[PDB]
Ligand binder design. Structure first.
Ligand SMILES: O=C(Cc1ccc(F)cc1)N1CCN(S(=O)(=O)c2cccc3cnccc23)CC1
Ligand SMILES: O=C(Cc1ccc(F)cc1)N1CCN(S(=O)(=O)c2cccc3cnccc23)CC1
Ligand SMILES: O=C(Cc1ccc(F)cc1)N1CCN(S(=O)(=O)c2cccc3cnccc23)CC1
Ligand SMILES: O=C(Cc1ccc(F)cc1)N1CCN(S(=O)(=O)c2cccc3cnccc23)CC1
Ligand SMILES: O=c1[nH]cnc2c1ncn2[C@@H]1O[C@H](COP(=O)(O)O)[C@@H](O)[C@H]1O
Ligand SMILES: O=c1[nH]cnc2c1ncn2[C@@H]1O[C@H](COP(=O)(O)O)[C@@H](O)[C@H]1O
Ligand SMILES: O=c1[nH]cnc2c1ncn2[C@@H]1O[C@H](COP(=O)(O)O)[C@@H](O)[C@H]1O
Ligand SMILES: O=c1[nH]cnc2c1ncn2[C@@H]1O[C@H](COP(=O)(O)O)[C@@H](O)[C@H]1O
Lengths: 331, 331, 331, 331
């Protein structure tokens, strides 16, 4: 074995991230303005725009959820607050029309009660929200939710970064599988634990387990540009979950901050000290202020549409079949 | 598959750019001063210097076209202006002697009328000027131009980045194929759409489709140094189209700009907000002022001549057979 | 041979360092708080935490050794001081309870006498401390120590970076093998001699020789983050030896230094001019002040525990079987 | 072909430079102080230290040549001056004892007369000094010199970067082959012409042609650290030629320069505008002042000795058999 030892499986794969690849143009009859951007969030739920906002307390509360749903995507309400308050935010969203909304739950002692209160509040999607879903406790929560409230509510499980973990969530009954262990912009899991999986490879692997069962994959974390959204979908994901790209918007929680004459908003990991209040796996940072959500989404979907034009993809289903070229450091 | 999934074709190639390769020296009887730098722009047109200026409104109007032709290359007049004005610029060039000149046309509703007005004005080369030529509308424009005015005018089609797209333009009747999707210095297609193809690989692939039909390939975009010109031709291109390298010259449109005691000129993508006036695929930037075009071309051709010396290439046709070494990040 | 010449063995391997790999998550029933972090330092000695402090005069004297042992690891006392003083530091550590302690010896003329004085002082571990242990003089010292005092004292040999060198130390009778030629943060061997071996590959190779003989491998040098500790153990090492990561602590020798309003401590290679007082193979630098050792170790072990959680490793022995993904420059 | 096209030979090799590799430690009985650093400069001339100074007018005139020879290496006098003056510098060196000295000649009209005047002056080594020796004019000069004065004078030919070019110089009668097209610190051939060959691969290839004929290879250009000297010799070179590493010394031509409170000396390519006084293939730069040559050489040889210690190489001939590990960008 060229990299050392006598075990070829010790280093199991070469992991690619978004920056490692570009989409290849292909024969096209598709105009960007006419591409169909709709896609499955879950087995049963189709969104008009394949984007969801991260379940983070500097990204998604009721205001962001309402704006995301109106833009044709969805928000996932964070769970770093009391149950009654999270459920009240679900009600606030439903009050603003027939708007789709999701909400995160953990697998702790109070997670079941949280889930039931969200259900009562009329939530459409429950996201079992962990750093590592390949675990009996997480798989049991997914299964029990699906068997109990699964007729009225779609259940998302995550996060995973391997084929076997995605397969386990599929077996548990997940309606969608969320992919991303370590790629987040505010993530320090890669330096603190030395654990992760570059996101293009993680998506390709999870899709290999999920697509043959008709389970959509949500690409979560590491998306820096609108082009990354196109790459993630081309890798086989059905939607993308955004934190950093949406934390700078007016609709996100938190105040404008002014440093050196420029405007910013705070953006922090749910595993940062500030969020948990210990061995943190996230930092507390800042992102440039970007203005209204509607305008950010327009530009993000605009980029996706351009990609669909270049690749001849009339639908997201066709984009999931596009090809990549791998690029070097120079590129 | 080591990079993920079960499909070996998902990541179809490893794409190299100019910085990924160097030309290998070979046995040489060629002195730089005596190398023959002439090359086919199209099937019928041979230039004394294998260089053309980009169809951009911060690079080529009549002044640049005249200077390029006198230097032994050619200018392609941009189309970001009314038809009558573009045609008037063609006439201005023809007024300055028997000078070759090209002009860009789109595939929009007014493109045909633009093309006919350019023809009337005495243009030598029409460039069907798009970001993605692998499209029925573009191929039809190429074909119809070639069948209508193809006896008196050479028709260039572009841009492409794959073998199949180059093949389609050849079948459509292109007299030359222009290569470059995403590599331009002012291009943001790679970050906005996540689409592109590193330029050495794009040239190698397009040449594989074009050379066996005797159709010359124009390498368009991403050339940063005179050495890149030699690499592009060695990859099989017959000419190179330059934007950034010529936007700093006296002959380009626009004014000198002074910032921090240094001189610059504005250089902007035709897909930038400022050019289109939306989801832009180019930026508005600046390049150092470089002085007279004649002098820039001298240095660029000087570098090419040196390369022909090192590789023993007496002609561009011989340079197209030179070999590369791939280098690493360290190199 | 693609990289040149006709000898495939000239470039014998592709060497990976910590930054080249990530740990892959796997099926897990392990909570970080419940993972067992104990591991063999030597054939006979098991530590509660798999960490030892470097034998450097800006890292480990009696104070650091006491604190390391109390934290469940061990200190190795440097040998850049007279024999009587090093032995007095061993006695100082033993005075503070039944605390494990190690001490470095060279292979010079006075090394044997140093070793015997340390033995008299009650040292638990002798570390034959060289830059290159694949040498008859070093192997003889290891063997003679093991045959003379080997019943009461464990003998560590190092450093090595190849399978054959590790094999030689095993044959000589080493109770543990220390791995690292060139990777230290303060090391200039790679630029001065052009010699080294990236540390993940060096560990994989040394482990291939040491594990089948039940000899533990100590990963020494190049660890920058707590995540690197997890990677090193996953590569097959049984413990990690830390210099830079512990030189910033209160317990390390030396004074606080203030530059530009920030606090630092001096950290220098034992091959630096200042340490030797010539062709130095280390620099004299500074590291940020990090506070109490206890707190640094808590965070380092915290990261390791997280990794054990992600990988489903209940023990270090299980972590040594985890898998990697190789990442690119982009990742 | 993964990188494009249908020709596997288009991209003929993967070129490695010094930074791409490290020397692997091996079994050693060699102490650095006792290693034998002598090596063949040419078939007949053995130096005590395997180092020669570049034929550049900011590196080697009589003072540097005298100092190099006294240090056990050799200087090659530049040829950017009238014949009588170069010959007078040869005489000045011979006046300072039985000191070896070389001198550069071109292949121009006056090169033969230059060569004869150097011969009369008592030069030991003539270096046919070009950027590309794979050329009939250069090979003829080498041959004619060798047949005319070859009994009393050793003839070096260069530069080359390929096996075939090295083979041609061997056939022409070269007593040594100098390797390096494009790697020099002050070189812009790689950006101006797009031509070059990373130096480890160039050495491996040239050695494959030269060693079986007993012709020593001189590694010329790109050496930045003393460790690079060890790498070059391990790749199979018999000596290294240094420009930048010696241009900062007291013995080099030119004055001390003070900028921002630090001392520098000018260092310029022989293909720079200033040297030629056009399309330059070198820049005019500055290097830190390093003090006396004797001290620089001590440190450089010190590093080489350390490498010989780590690799168990008692002689340079043994070092030429050492092995490498290839490293990544991270390493
Ligand atoms: O409970 C723990 C500790 C733990 C848990 C299990 C395990 F297997 C190992 C360690 N954490 C730490 C990680 N987070 S997080 O906030 O940083 C996080 C949240 C959403 C997605 C993420 C994806 N990748 C990385 C982190 C992610 C959640 C809480
Ligand atoms: O019409 C569109 C949108 C579009 C069109 C089709 C398609 F398949 C996807 C998206 N554009 C956007 C791209 N440009 S451009 O000005 O930026 C451009 C111009 C010359 C060459 C280029 C090469 N690569 C990249 C851009 C290039 C042209 C207009
Ligand atoms: O005696 C020598 C010279 C020498 C010795 C043998 C040999 F094979 C070649 C050269 N040295 C120089 C290297 N050191 S060190 O202080 O820099 C050092 C100390 C702990 C571990 C290290 C790992 N890698 C690198 C250096 C290391 C020890 C003394
Ligand atoms: O005559 C020419 C032009 C030329 C000559 C032939 C050829 F095949 C192509 C171009 N030159 C330009 C290159 N130099 S140099 O001073 O820059 C130079 C000098 C020593 C070694 C070098 C190694 N690599 C690169 C440059 C080198 C010499 C003069
Ligand atoms: O503290 C943290 N550490 C690691 N990952 C986090 C943390 N907080 C949130 N995440 C994940 O990072 C995603 C957002 O990543 P981003 O869009 O690149 O900023 C979120 O959807 C989570 O999956
Ligand atoms: O706005 C843009 N986005 C992407 N490519 C552009 C744009 N405008 C011009 N181009 C292309 O970039 C080429 C010039 O690239 P450059 O020489 O690297 O600056 C032009 O010839 C076009 O093919
Ligand atoms: O001067 C030196 N040169 C090279 N390696 C050294 C030197 N001094 C100590 N070391 C080694 O570097 C290790 C610490 O590396 P670090 O933890 O990355 O700082 C030590 O345990 C030694 O093995
Ligand atoms: O102007 C130049 N352009 C390219 N190579 C040069 C030039 N001048 C000298 N050289 C070569 O560069 C070598 C020195 O390289 P350095 O030691 O890396 O600075 C010299 O021995 C020459 O072979």
């Amino acid at each position: 074995v060229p990299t050392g030892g006598d075990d070829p499986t010790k280093i199991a794969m070469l992991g690619l991230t978004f920056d490692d690849v570009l989409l290849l143009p292909a024969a096209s009859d598709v105009l960007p303005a006419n591409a169909d951007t709709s896609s499955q969030l879950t087995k049963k739920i189709r969104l008009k725009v394949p984007l969801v906002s991260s379940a983070m307390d500097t990204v998604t509360e009721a205001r962001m959820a309402i704006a995301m749903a109106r833009a044709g995507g969805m928000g996932v309400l964070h769970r770093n607050l009391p149950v009654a308050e999270q459920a009240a935010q679900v009600e606030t969203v439903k009050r603003s029309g027939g708007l789709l909304v999701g909400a995160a739950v953990g697998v702790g002692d109070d997670a079941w009660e949280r889930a039931m209160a969200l259900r009562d509040a009329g939530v459409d999607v429950l996201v079992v929200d962990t750093a590592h879903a390949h675990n009996r406790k997480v798989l049991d929560m997914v299964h029990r939710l699906k068997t109990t409230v699964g007729d009225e509510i779609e259940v998302v499980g995550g996060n995973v970064a391997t084929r076997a973990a995605a397969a386990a969530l599929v077996e548990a009954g997940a309606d969608a599988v969320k992919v991303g262990v370590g790629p987040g912009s505010i993530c320090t899991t890669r330096v603190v634990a030395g654990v992760g999986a570059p996101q293009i490879t993680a998506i390709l692997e999870a899709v290999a387990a999920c697509a043959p069962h008709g389970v959509p994959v949500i690409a979560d974390g590491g998306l820096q540009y609108s082009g990354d959204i196109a790459k993630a979908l081309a890798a086989g994901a059905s939607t993308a979950m955004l934190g950093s790209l949406l934390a700078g918007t007016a609709e996100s929680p938190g105040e404008l901050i002014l440093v050196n004459g420029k405007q910013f908003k705070s953006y922090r990991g749910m595993g940062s000290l500030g969020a948990m209040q210990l061995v943190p796996e996230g930092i507390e940072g800042r992102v440039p202020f970007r203005g209204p959500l509607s305008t950010v989404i327009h530009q993000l979907v605009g980029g996706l549409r351009a990609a669909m034009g270049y690749t001849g993809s009339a639908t997201i289903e066709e984009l999931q079949q596009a090809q990549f070229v791998q690029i070097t450091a120079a590129g």
